[PDB]
Design a protein around this ligand. Structure first.
Ligand SMILES: [Fe+3]
Length: 278
């Protein structure tokens, strides 16, 4: 029943660094702020990534989107029937997130998830990137995807698939990482039992052309943030590179051209070619 990943919020120590990193390096558009948070756009939505101060330096929340008010109610029922605790968002939160309905819960292991419907769009104020990027691929596939580090894969799997309704695409023995989808995007969430002290390992934005990626690589390289050379994944075939975010241990992946989802298969390497570690 979850349709797609629509937005992400980070609680970071260096907001100045995050702002600069998101605009000048990644190419997102600054969209003001909501509360203590600075907002950034990637398309027509009023915002896609929120950055706020915090000693946490990690992903503070994930917005999971559904198509209408009724579907939101159906998620309410599903969560209750599955016995998962949740809370309705109040007027304050709803207008801070610019959504029309909002259920708040958390995955086991502690990641705050927000299920919403009716987001705000601003077409009269067309998106203008802060760095040279022709555009991002969002739409029905949502904002991108992230790799959630969890202590127990089977427990995380059951929740994401059984209650949230994600479906497995395939596995890669990196620790077997499990990739799940909830729309055409090969994966919106990947679950892996990595020994890092973080909620996620990385998030990924998909650009329209290979040049977008090439240009971004140079921008991030000049900043000294590259951690992975250009490459292409085995399972979704995304062509990308990885770079360090201003928050230690969390990284970004800028990619292009992934295939869309189907049959579960198993891969032994994450890279088809490339992706050499730097
Ligand atoms: Fe990825």
């Amino acid at each position: 029943s979850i349709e797609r990943l629509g937005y992400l919020g980070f609680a970071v120590k260096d907001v100045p660094a995050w702002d600069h990193f998101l605009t000048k390096s990644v190419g997102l558009m600054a969209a003001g702020s909501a509360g203590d948070a600075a907002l950034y756009r990637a398309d027509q939505r009023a915002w896609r990534i929120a950055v706020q101060p915090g000693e946490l330096d990690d992903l503070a929340y994930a917005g999971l989107e559904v198509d209408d008010a009724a579907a939101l109610e159906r998620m309410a029922d599903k969560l209750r029937q599955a016995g998962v605790a949740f809370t309705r968002g109040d007027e304050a939160l709803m207008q801070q997130r610019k959504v029309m309905g909002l259920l708040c819960l958390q995955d086991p292991f502690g990641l705050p998830l927000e299920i919403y419907y009716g987001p705000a769009e601003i077409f009269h104020e067309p998106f203008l990137p802060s760095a040279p990027v022709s555009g991002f691929v969002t739409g029905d596939q949502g904002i991108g995807h992230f790799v959630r580090c969890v202590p127990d894969t089977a427990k995380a799997m059951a929740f994401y698939t059984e209650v949230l309704g994600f479906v497995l695409s395939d596995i890669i023995d990196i620790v077997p990482a499990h990739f799940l989808h909830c729309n055409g995007r090969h994966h919106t969430i990947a679950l892996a039992a990595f020994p890092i002290p973080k909620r996620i390992h990385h998030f990924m934005l998909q650009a329209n052309t290979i040049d977008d990626v090439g240009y971004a690589f140079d921008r991030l390289d000049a900043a000294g943030r590259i951690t992975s050379l250009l490459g292409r994944h085995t399972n979704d075939q995304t062509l990308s590179f990885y770079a360090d975010t201003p928050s230690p241990m969390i990284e970004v992946e800028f990619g292009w051209g992934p295939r869309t989802v189907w049959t579960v298969a198993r891969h032994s390497r994450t890279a088809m070619w490339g992706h050499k570690s730097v």
